[PDB]
């Protein structure tokens, strides 16, 4: 029961070059590597996702489009920033957290990372926010092998919407997203009224959450919606996207988080001893998502990291006091209680019925 990292050279300078998160994945592997984390793990190479394991979730015609356009008419229908080589990214990620996600099922581990995963907005047919494939789905889909019912975990600052899709007519999978919502906040879904659909009727929980939040409050909020929805739902398996674009510091400039909230909610989940698929998904900031990352990797690890961050690579990008430790901005907290309080409540009458 070691943790599986999955990592290649490979897949990391695949990813380091995806346009809007230049050199993320590896800023963060080199930071992981330069406190020596990856020696309290498998590493596990990334398979690449074939066309069939892709259609699980995306149809044929819309993996044929991006497929084609990576090698401009119809690119609207589907939502088409159409670069070159754009399809083999996308299935490399892809495969990557399907891998991580057959680990599990063969008993190899009992939590399994892909931080270069997350990217929770595609759709079955659309490319959405960024995202072109739902390695995020992909990997549930690959989860219901073995395990009927799965609790999908989003720590996003956006809506996972692209997930709570895939699913919201079921009940095999209930998604939990806590999210930034406000007027022309993207993706402008996931209000607390949403809760799926016909069969998977209260099974989508969304927890709609203003700028300024931290550490503490977003803890609070995040175990009392955790707690129901282990006694409501009862899952086996779990799959937790773990965004940066939360952390201060980050440009999206919303939440005021720290890493180490969002580690408490991973430790929080981590006690479940179930099967656990980590991904990463947006963070901005490429040293603070790094942090982020790396202290999450050693919650997973549960052991203990000096504040100096290491000399290697990229230390030059963790400017000013070159620690670990993120620090949040002097900015309010826009979260009225009582607002939040209503939120728990009606979501606790919505996980009632199930
Ligand atoms: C500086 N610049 C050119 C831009 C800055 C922000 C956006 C944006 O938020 N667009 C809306 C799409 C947000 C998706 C973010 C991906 C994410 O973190 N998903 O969870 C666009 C352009
Ligand atoms: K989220
Ligand atoms: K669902
Ligand atoms: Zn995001």
Not at 178 to 205: A, C, E, M, N
Not at 216 to 230: A, H
Not at 265 to 275: E, P
Request: proline share 5%; net charge neutral; charged share 20%.
């Amino acid at each position: 029961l070691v943790p599986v990292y999955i990592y290649s050279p490979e897949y990391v300078s695949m990813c380091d070059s995806l346009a809007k998160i230049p050199k993320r994945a590896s800023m963060v592997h080199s930071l992981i590597e330069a406190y020596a984390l990856h020696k309290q793990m498998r590493i596990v190479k990334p398979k690449v996702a074939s066309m069939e394991e892709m259609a699980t979730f995306h149809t044929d015609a819309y993996l044929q489009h991006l497929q084609k356009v990576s090698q401009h008419p119809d690119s609207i229908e589907y939502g088409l920033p159409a670069t070159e080589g754009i399809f083999d990214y996308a299935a490399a990620i892809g495969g990557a957290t399907i891998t991580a996600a057959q680990c599990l099922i063969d008993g190899m581990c009992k939590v399994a990372i892909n931080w270069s995963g997350g990217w929770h907005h595609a759709k079955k047919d659309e490319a959405s926010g960024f995202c072109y494939l739902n390695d995020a789905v992909l990997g549930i889909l690959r989860l219901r092998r073995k395990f009927e019912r799965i609790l999908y975990v989003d720590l996003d600052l956006h809506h996972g919407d692209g997930v709570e899709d895939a699913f919201s007519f079921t009940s095999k999978v209930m998604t939990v997203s806590l999210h930034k919502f406000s007027p022309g906040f993207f993706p402008g879904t996931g209000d607390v009224s949403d809760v799926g659909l016909g069969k998977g009727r209260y099974y989508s929980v969304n927890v709609p959450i203003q700028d300024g939040i931290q550490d503490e409050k977003y803890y609070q909020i995040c175990e009392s919606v955790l707690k129901e929805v282990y006694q409501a739902f009862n899952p086996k398996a779990v799959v937790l996207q773990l965004g940066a674009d939360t952390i201060a510091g980050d440009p999206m400039c919303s939440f005021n988080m720290t890493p180490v909230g969002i580690g408490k909610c991973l430790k929080y989940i981590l006690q479940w001893q179930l099967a656990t698929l980590i991904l990463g998904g947006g963070g901005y900031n490429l040293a603070n998502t790094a942090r982020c990352w790396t202290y999450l990797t050693r919650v997973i690890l549960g052991k203990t990291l000096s504040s100096e961050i290491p000399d290697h690579e990229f230390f030059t990008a963790y400017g000013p006091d070159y620690v670990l430790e993120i620090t949040p901005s002097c900015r309010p907290d826009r979260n009225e209680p009582h607002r939040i309080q209503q939120i728990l409540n009606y979501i606790k009458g919505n996980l009632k019925h199930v």
